[PDB]
Structures are given as structure tokens and as C-alpha cells.
């Protein structure tokens, strides 16, 4: 990051850390969300802290806040990259990737496919059963950590 970039994080962080102690508590998180019309229970807010609380000491320090913000940004950038790829792969722009189009993608990426392979790729990724790959289906094929 750069100096302005860290400034943005500090300030975002300060929106939560009113007492300036350099960590954010369940009480403070609760406070921020109360200003959004939601009413989280103390057992609720604890789970939210839990999701960010890497070292597990009950509060969220600044470096922990960083890591999880960088990860929300990475997910944003990934969705953007997935939309750009879909747009390139769906050459006729009809909103669906077809067999022919996937064959072309795969040929462009260095692979040598049979039709039975293309059909089994499409079939495993095909959620609504229409025999082509829409955007939501492509998202799951791109984000499979399996």
C-alpha cells in the first residue's frame, strides 16, 4: 500500500475505534451497526468480531482490519475479472457460453479437447440444464477451489 492508502484504512478503522485504543471491540462494532438500523445481539456481534479476529484475543486490531479489507477488495476485483473473462468467452454476446465458444476458449488456452470432453465440462457446470454456461454458472466454475 501507499501512504494515502494507509490513511484511508486508518480512517475507515477510526469510524469503528472511537476511543482511539487501536482495537475494535464488540461494543464498538455493535454501536456502528446500531447506527444502521440493525439490532445485533451481543452473541451476534461476537461472531462478527470472530470472523475478523485472527489471533483470537476477542478484539480486532488494525493489521487484522487490513487483512480482511484487502480480502474484500480482492473479492471485488475477482468479480470484476470474472465478468471481463465471461464477456471475452461469450463472443456473440448472447449471455451464454456455448460448446463452440468453450472449445475456442480451451484451444486458445493450449488444450486439445474432444467433443465428449467439452460436453462433460459444460454438463458439470450446467446448473439450469440448458446445455450452455450462463454468467452465474461460469462464476462457480471460476471460483471452484475444487
Amino acid at each position: 500500500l501507499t501512504e494515502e492508502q494507509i490513511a484511508e484504512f486508518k480512517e475507515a478503522f477510526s469510524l469503528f475505534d472511537k476511543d482511539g485504543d487501536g482495537t475494535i471491540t464488540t461494543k464498538e462494532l455493535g454501536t456502528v451497526m446500531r447506527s444502521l438500523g440493525q439490532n445485533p445481539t451481543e452473541a451476534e456481534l461476537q461472531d462478527m468480531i470472530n470472523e475478523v479476529d485472527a489471533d483470537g484475543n476477542g478484539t480486532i486490531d488494525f493489521p487484522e482490519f487490513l487483512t480482511m479489507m484487502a480480502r474484500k477488495m480482492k473479492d471485488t476485483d475477482s468479480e470484476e475479472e470474472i465478468r471481463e473473462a465471461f464477456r471475452v468467452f461469450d463472443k456473440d454476446g448472447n449471455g451464454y457460453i456455448s460448446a463452440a465458444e468453450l472449445r475456442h476458449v480451451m484451444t486458445n488456452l493450449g488444450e486439445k479437447l474432444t467433443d465428449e470432453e467439452v460436453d462433460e465440462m459444460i454438463r458439470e457446470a450446467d446448473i439450469d440444464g440448458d446445455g450452455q454456461v450462463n454468467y452465474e454458472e461460469f462464476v462457480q466454475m471460476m471460483t471452484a477451489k475444487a
Binding site: 475507515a12 479489507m69 446448473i127
Partner: protein, 66 residues
């Protein structure tokens, strides 16, 4: 005498995998169209907004009489 054949097992796999994929599709949609605000996105947006507003004001002045 009766077990699921490998063929049968594969059939089950497809149905459940398909169930899972619709689930993942629902979760992504609950997420973009929810009304419960993410306090991190919100804080960051409130910080971004105030920063742009302060850069625009300095910019109007810097352009004032040119």
C-alpha cells in the same frame, strides 16, 4: 442383496451437486440484494465519500478564475 451401484452413486452425486450449486447461486443473490448493510463496506464508503467531497472542493477553488 441391494446396494447402490456405482452408476446409482453417480446419479446421486449429480443431484446433490446440483442442489449445492443452486445453493451457492442463492447465497450470492441473497448477498447482493440484502438490505442488512455491511458495516465495513459502509464505513469504507463513508470514508471514500468524505474524501472525494474534500478533493472536489479544493478543485473548484483551484479552477475558480481560470
Amino acid at each position: 442383496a441391494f446396494a447402490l451401484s456405482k452408476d446409482k452413486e453417480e446419479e446421486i452425486r449429480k443431484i446433490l451437486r446440483n442442489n449445492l450449486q443452486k445453493t451457492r447461486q442463492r447465497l450470492r443473490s441473497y448477498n447482493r440484494h440484502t438490505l442488512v448493510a455491511d458495516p465495513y463496506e459502509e464505513a469504507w464508503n463513508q470514508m471514500l465519500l468524505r474524501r472525494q467531497k474534500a478533493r472536489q472542493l479544493e478543485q473548484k477553488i483551484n479552477n475558480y478564475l481560470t
